[PDB]
Structures are given as C-alpha cells and as structure tokens.
Amino acid sequence: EAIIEEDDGDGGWVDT
Amino acid sequence: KFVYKEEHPFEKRRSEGEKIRKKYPDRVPVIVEKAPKARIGDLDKKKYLVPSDLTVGQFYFLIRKRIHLRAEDALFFFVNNVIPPTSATMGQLYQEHHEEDFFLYIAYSDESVYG
C-alpha cells in the first residue's frame, strides 16, 4: 500500500 | 453532501488541490465517500491519486477490492447524483466535474439512486 503526501494531516493520498 | 467539504475549509482544500494538480500533472485527485442511504462498507481512505487514464470500470474494481465487496454485492458511483459512464476516464471526469477546490468528488452506494 503506497500513500503519497502522508505528512499532510489527511491520511495521505492512496497512490494507484 | 460530502463530509470532506465540511471537515476541511474551502481555502485549505483549494490550495492543496492546486498543489497536487501542479506536482502530479498526469494524475487526478479524487475524494471518495459513501452515500448516506448506502448499506455497504465504508472506505478507510477517502483521497485517491489516480492516473488520468484510469477508467470508471477500473476504479469500480479497485474500490470493490478495497472494501471487501463480493460480486453478488452491487456498487454504483455517482458524480453529481449521476452514474458516470464506465468507459469514461478519471481525467475526463475531472475536466468536466472537478469542483472549484480542484478535487473530483465521487459518491458510491449499493443503490442505483443516490441517497
């Protein structure tokens, strides 16, 4: 499971 | 409608959306939520960075996998209370229906009518 920009306090963006 | 638009201000969202659109130009940022009257399982993650060439049908498949949905179970997407064509690309959907915060919003339900 890759997550992008997880630092932002939003759980990050699921990279597909 | 969407809780993401309530839990986050417009100005914050718009800035992040521009940032993402400029840094990941080949990708589309999509916020995904369950419709209220929907009786299917919820998605832990709501934000998805998807290739602009990804199709509605491919996205149906991934979301089905991600909420542990059986084939006997139904799933519909709604873009502005309208089921998008499965042949459509996420990029085309963004170009046409991205909100002013530069995100594409999509609801999903077990029913063919949003609620």
Numbering used by the authors:
A (entry chain B): 95 to 110
B (entry chain A): 2 to 116
Give sentences copied directly from the paper behind this entry:
Proteins of the LC3 or GABARAP families are conjugated via their C-terminal glycine residue to phosphatidylethanolamine-containing lipids. This process is catalyzed by an intricate enzymatic cascade in which ATG7 functions as an activating E1 enzyme using ATP to form a thioester with LC3/GABARAP and transferring them to an E2 enzyme, ATG3, via a trans-thioesterification reaction. ATG3 performs the lipidation of LC3/GABARAP in conjunction with an E3-like enzyme complex of isopeptide-linked ATG5-ATG12. Proteins containing LIR motifs are recruited to LC3/GABARAP through hydrophobic interactions.
To further corroborate our findings, we cocrystallized GABARAP with an LIRATG3 peptide (Y90–H112). We solved the cocrystal structure at a resolution of 2.6 Å and could resolve amino acids E95–T110 of the LIRATG3 peptide. GABARAP adopted its previously described closed conformation and showed no structural rearrangements. The structure of the LIR peptide and also its interactions with GABARAP were consistent with respect to the ColabFold prediction with a backbone-atom root-mean-square deviation of 0.61 Å. ATG3 W107 binds to HP1 via hydrophobic interactions in a deep pocket formed by GABARAP P30, K48, and F104. ATG3 V108 is buried by hydrophobic interactions with GABARAP K46 and Y49 and the upper strand of the LIR β-sheet (E95, I97). Thr110 likely mimics the canonical LIR residues, Ile, Leu, and Val, by rotation of its methyl group to form hydrophobic contacts with HP2, enabling its alcohol moiety to participate in H-bonding interactions with Pro52. To form the observed β-sheet conformation, residues N-terminal of W107 form a hairpin turn consisting of glycine and aspartic acid residues, mainly binding via H-bonding and electrostatic interactions to GABARAP. Aspartic and glutamic acid residues E99, E100, D101, and D102 form salt bridges with various basic residues, K20, K24, and K48.
